[PDB]
Design a protein around this ligand. Structure first.
Ligand SMILES: CCCCCCCCCCCCCC(=O)O
Ligand SMILES: CCCCCCCCCCCCCC(=O)O
Lengths: 154, 154
């Protein structure tokens, strides 16, 4: 991934988001309901000191569960690191703050097109697919407005 | 689907094919290993009287199984009908016979990009994605050359 948002103002991504589309390098990352990177973003919560808290839902043990994970800031504004067994980065590729936000996670690679409202934003999906053609994705999903209004996009 | 191959010569699609990419209208059609339209084409076998026999593999009961299904000809050369509880059509969208073949099945809709050899044919995938932008797909998968040489693309 060699797309990052120049001049990102992280405080301005705060609030409500919808995981409109997802893609990943390996089918197994997204294939099933309980696949490891089948995560549905609810809210982005920047800290005053510039970390990025992410509220999301994930299907685990036959149930739609709440998760809260902290992605810690780095020297680069558009790059955050999640504390785990593995060093994994969260990258903000692009955003206009008010409509769409493109982000990826890598260790191999998964990405999402986030939007502010439960609508199919063709313009944001164009920007997502453009970003992705530089990346070796083998699975891509997208949700309809009804699914976007349901826990775990059921 | 309002893309069919003009002047199709069905006898010339005979032989070996690889399911390089798949897409479908509903995630559930392709999501898991045993999803209903997760089928891997092995061979196309036109009959002398112009029907299209399809040899494929499908994951069923925790196993990669052989299937043979007959798609019967219609008045339209690029449209075939599979005998089931439901009337389902197989449509040949496009082919150059020697490299790629795009086909869909509808009742809602799933499509594949077939290629003759276990290679990622970027040119055929461009033609596949072009065909698909006219269609309401919500899941898309693609296979690497290693997976293409394995039973059920394992
Ligand atoms: C996949 C790109 C969008 C990034 C979404 C936020 C990153 C968090 C996903 C990592 C897995 C979270 C599940 C957990 O381990 O509790
Ligand atoms: C999905 C577009 C490619 C068409 C592949 C050939 C169509 C056959 C799939 C229908 C399901 C076959 C499994 C079975 O019912 O035995």
């Amino acid at each position: 991934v060699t797309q990052t948002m120049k001049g990102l103002d992280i405080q301005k991504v705060a609030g409500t988001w919808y995981s409109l589309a997802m893609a990943a390098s390996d089918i197994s990352l997204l294939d099933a309901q309980s696949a490891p990177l089948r995560v549905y973003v609810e809210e982005l919560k920047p800290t005053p000191e510039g970390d990025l808290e992410i509220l999301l839902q994930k299907w685990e043990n036959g149930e739609c569960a709440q998760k809260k994970i902290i992605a810690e800031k780095t020297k680069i504004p558009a790059v955050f690191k999640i504390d785990a067994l593995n060093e994994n980065k969260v990258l903000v590729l692009d955003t206009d703050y008010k409509k769409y936000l493109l982000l990826c996670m890598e260790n191999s690679l998964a990405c999402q097109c986030l939007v502010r409202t439960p609508e199919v934003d063709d313009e944001a999906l164009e920007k997502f697919d453009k970003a992705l053609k530089a990346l070796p994705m083998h699975i891509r999903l997208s949700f309809n407005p009804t699914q976007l209004e349901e826990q775990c996009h059921i």
